[PDB]
Design a protein around this ligand. Structure first.
Ligand SMILES: Oc1ccc(C2(c3ccc(O)cc3)CCCCC2)cc1
Ligand SMILES: Oc1ccc(C2(c3ccc(O)cc3)CCCCC2)cc1
Lengths: 226, 226
């Protein structure tokens, strides 16, 4: 009756934060900002692949299904990270401790509209007082619930969805008795995450095609997987 | 302890079906198919505005907030309708009783990819054995949970979300004791609905800009509202 083991487990499995390391020799530009961001994403993708797979049941899926889930969910997982890191800030996005974007910098990078949607996600979670326990559980649910069209073992993926959903249910029933509908409210934040991810993928795909911003192999593989 | 009044109420508030009435004098073409579809959407938008509103609390919102919710959610509500009408079919979308699209017709209309996503929604709901009670409750939740950036009374909209969520919870606790997580599973279908809506809006906005397909005023107002 002290809280849910899956939640406890996801908390200890949480990766250490990564630095963006913008090149201090390079003049600030939209190209610099986008290059720095895509480089950070590439490195975070490695972390995410390693992180997944720790999710109970995930490593028992075929490598194909593991890949399918990751290829569908990666943008949502990246976005939920920057949202969480940004909860204590106002109108700023904490991509990394050394890379915090305000409205002006978003404009300069051509990301004002996209970043404003991310800020909408932040605003909603601030109102809800999203906890770390809830954040890690939602990242794992976003992975399991990512709607890949290419899944081999649909029943096994549904089972993963269920284990993680039950964990959220249990956590909320124990920790948040004042709100018998909090788990559901948390699940109801997922559509805006999906919407913002969908738009972010299209945006960076367009940037990929325009050919002006260098991108690493893994990030390109993940982008091209949609 | 017989089922939830909000669910009962949404069932009786369900609009009658509408016909597409493709013009039988016009040769089949992508233009004919898209014109017929946008015309059907325009007429369904009127129905949806009338339907909303019957949702408890909805008419008590400012006209601004009523409009904001409708302008954000309309595509999701239209899509959930064609999904529901299509549950008893295989690889076909029942836009209307007189307008059922198979894979070949989708290709001809340039909607193969979009319609395939809608078919993914259908497939998931078929597996879950979505009921009419659950369909109408999800349409109302999609309206309340539509993430407009323009809401005046955020607390009032959150209250609407909560009333409808509680209705789903209650319905599932009474009707589906075999699955204590069914309400949550239903909420977890909303991200794919949002994703498919997001893509459909962009697609028809592109068609709007290309200027080849005639569109009526209300449909244009709703499209331009995103
Ligand atoms: O932790 C993150 C989150 C998002 C990101 C990206 C991002 C996504 C959306 C956005 O509005 C800004 C940056 C960088 C650019 C490539 C896609 C992912 C990078 C690291
Ligand atoms: O009941 C509906 C549902 C969707 C539709 C549209 C639709 C949406 C998505 C899609 O893949 C096909 C048609 C018609 C074209 C204008 C947008 C809405 C019309 C009536």
């Amino acid at each position: 009756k002290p809280y849910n083991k899956i939640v406890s487990h996801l908390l200890v499995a949480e990766p250490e934060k990564i630095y963006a390391m913008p090149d201090p020799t390079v003049p600030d530009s939209d190209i610099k900002a986008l290059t720095t961001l895509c480089d950070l994403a590439d490195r975070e993708l490695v972390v995410i692949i390693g992180w997944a797979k720790h999710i109970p049941g995930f490593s028992t899926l075929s490598l194909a299904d593991q890949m399918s889930l990751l290829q569908s969910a990666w943008m949502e997982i990246l976005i939920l990270g920057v949202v969480y890191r940004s909860l204590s800030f106002e109108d700023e996005l904490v991509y990394a401790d050394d890379y915090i974007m305000d409205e002006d910098q978003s404009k300069l990078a051509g990301l004002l509209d996209l970043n404003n949607a991310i800020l909408q996600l932040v605003k909603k979670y601030k109102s809800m007082k999203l906890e770390k326990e809830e954040f890690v559980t939602l990242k794992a649910i976003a992975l399991a619930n990512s709607d890949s069209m290419h899944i081999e073992d649909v029943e096994a993926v549904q089972k993963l969805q269920d284990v993680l959903h039950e964990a959220l249910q249990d956590y909320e029933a124990g920790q948040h008795m004042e709100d018998p509908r909090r788990a559901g409210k948390m699940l109801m934040t997922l559509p805006l995450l999906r919407q913002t991810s969908t738009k972010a993928v299209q945006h960076f795909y367009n940037i990929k095609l325009e050919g002006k911003v260098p991108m690493h192999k893994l990030f390109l593989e993940m982008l091209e997987a949609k």
